[PDB]
A paper describes a structure:
The protein [name]/GCS1 (here called [name]) is a gamete fusogen that is found in a wide range of eukaryotes including protists, algae, plants, insects, and hemichordates, and may be the “Eve” that enabled sex to evolve in early eukaryotes. Remarkably, [name] is structurally related to fusogens present in the membrane of enveloped viruses that allow them to fuse with and infect host cells. Although their sequences are highly divergent, [name] and viral class II fusogens have a common overall fold and domain arrangement. Here, we study the gamete fusogen [name] from [name] (Cyani), an extremophile red algae that grows at acidic pH at 45 °C. [name] has a trimeric postfusion structure with similarity to viral class II fusion proteins, but its prefusion structure has been elusive.
The Cyani [name] ectodomain (aa 28–564) was expressed in Drosophila S2 cells. A crystal structure of Cyani [name] to 2.3 Å resolution was solved by molecular replacement with the Chlamy postfusion [name] structure, and was refined to Rwork and Rfree values of 22.3 and 26.2%, respectively. Cyani [name] crystallizes as a monomer and has a rod-like shape with D3 in line with D2 and D1. It is much more extended than Chlamy [name], in which D3 folds back over D2 and D1 in the trimeric, postfusion state. Multi-angle light scattering (MALS) showed that Cyani [name] was monomeric in solution. PISA assembly analysis of the Cyani [name] crystal structure showed that no significant interactions with other monomers were present in the crystal lattice and thus that Cyani [name] was monomeric at high concentrations in crystals as well as in solution. The fusion loops of Cyani [name] locate to the membrane distal end of D2. Surprisingly, a β-sheet with three β-strands is present in D1 that is absent in the postfusion state of [name]; we therefore term it the interim β-sheet. Although the interim β-sheet locates to the boundary of D1 with D3, it shares two backbone hydrogen bonds and an extensive hydrophobic interface with other residues in D1 and is therefore part of D1. Switching of the J0 β-strand from the interim β-sheet to the D1 β-sandwich in the postfusion state dictates a large change in orientation and position of D3 of [name], as the J0 β-strand leads directly into D3.
Author numbering: 37 to 45, 52 to 255, 274 to 470, 477 to 527, 537 to 560
The structure:
Amino acid sequence: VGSIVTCLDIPCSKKWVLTLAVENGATAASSSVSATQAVYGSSSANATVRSADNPNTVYAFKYQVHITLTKSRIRLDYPLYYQSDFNNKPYEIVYKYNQKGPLNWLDNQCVATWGSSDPTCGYAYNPSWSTKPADRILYSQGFCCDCNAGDLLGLSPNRIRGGLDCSLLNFDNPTESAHCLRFDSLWYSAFQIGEPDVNFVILVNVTKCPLANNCSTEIISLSPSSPIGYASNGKISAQAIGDFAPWEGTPSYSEKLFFVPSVCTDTSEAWCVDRISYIPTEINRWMLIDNDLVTITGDTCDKIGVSYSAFTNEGQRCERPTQSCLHDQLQDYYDSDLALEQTGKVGSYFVQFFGDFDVSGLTPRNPLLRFFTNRTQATEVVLQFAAEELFYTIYLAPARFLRHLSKINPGGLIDLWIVSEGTGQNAAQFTVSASCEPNVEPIQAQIVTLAPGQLVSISLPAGVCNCTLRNALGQVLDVLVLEFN
Ligand SMILES: *[C@@H]1O[C@H](CO)[C@@H](O[C@@H]2O[C@H](CO)[C@@H](O[C@@H]3O[C@H](CO)[C@@H](O)[C@H](O[C@@H]4O[C@H](CO)[C@@H](O)[C@H](O[C@H]5O[C@H](CO)[C@@H](O)[C@H](O)[C@@H]5O)[C@@H]4O)[C@@H]3O)[C@H](O)[C@H]2NC(C)=O)[C@H](O)[C@H]1NC(C)=O
Ligand SMILES: *[C@@H]1O[C@H](CO)[C@@H](O)[C@H](O)[C@H]1NC(C)=O
């Protein structure tokens, strides 16, 4: 049980403070109880609460109080920091014709020199919707391959990427090829990951019921981010207490990037609309991928985010097969883990393979990285109650029998004098009992009310009388023995 404090300079004049602990657990059908629950003001002994200062006052429950605390599973929430967006699978297209016919060195050359208004691949622009030549993206026009001798050794070595037949002397036969970088419809958003925060929910049910010798219910929710809640017009407050910091050994994903599918540039591709659908089977296919598998600058080949500079500047580009520089993309990680998921094995990139990923309440374009855990831990919950309506005051003053005045005259009439000593204006109720034993009919006790400093006399109708003074609540103050007859 808790004590009662005066409300120092949380709205109250007097305040009941109680501290409880609640712990979470995996209950089952058989053992279904993890709750912390306590009742107050129901038994005849726990009906009063000691005061912090001035013990002469105790507070009795006006209602019987039911408080129940339950704790959710413990979740690790990883803060996300937006990096940029990344294409799912870039692909190379090869052009060997244009609107004039086959590409060749004589009458219809492949054009990819920077600055030309005539690139066979076209340019890309930044912003993408622009056609201003000043907004052309460097290296976006791709590059040409032809039936010449490159700087390195060989005879017509640049024919390989475009599949050119450098032996036919024929104007229907193209002798040059253009190579352009393109991005498929699906774009992922990538996030950096911070160190996790702990999260849980504590439900506090406070139920007031009448005394017995209708019920009311208020629910307070508590969390590490919102640790203080109120109820019944600020008359009640609950607060979770402790170091909510993550523990040692919690998994860290700092070196990784959170890859969330976000955008379809061509919404007419049903496969793309599926990849961004916020349903649990696809959200569990979002990916954590090591940062060193990504190129944020796009000038590194065979890395997530590869772009025009890496594609065009690859050494001996024309001697390489198509789609070179474009390996190991998000689509390849997806297919790799998808086949593992489709065969009951454990992959390396899907979030479902990292733990109990929370898919609830996720809104598109506002993703989160949250994992439920094994953890069970106790959390102290401090409760405060405005005592104005929960308790009425009960005062306890000292009280003596005035021995120099309380006598017995020789008919049974006991003249008793009681004094309450001290200062105060709050009366206290006292019970006076008499136990005259030898052949004396019973004497009924009587309640007397005395404020500090007051003094009253009451008469009670070979013997001896045991007279006892009792407090308003389960105490005895003074006892005097007096002879009779
Ligand atoms: C906040 O906290 C307070 C108290 O801490 C809660 O109030 C308490 O709610 C309890 C249930 O909600 C309630 O206990 C009930 O007592 C009733 C009898 O007085 C029961 O009818 C009631 O439901 C039963 O529970 C049984 C458990 O299995 C169940 O078997 C039973 O169903 C069988 O029995 C009926 C016949 O009664 C058949 O018709 C039926 O077909 C089944 O055979 C039934 O479900 C439960 O036992 C407490 O009395 C409440 N205490 C107080 C002080 O009010 C609040 O609910 C909490 N608030 C919130 C929001 O959580
Ligand atoms: C929880 O921990 C226990 C041992 O402490 C382990 O056996 C169990 O597999 C764990 N479960 C989960 C879901 O982490």
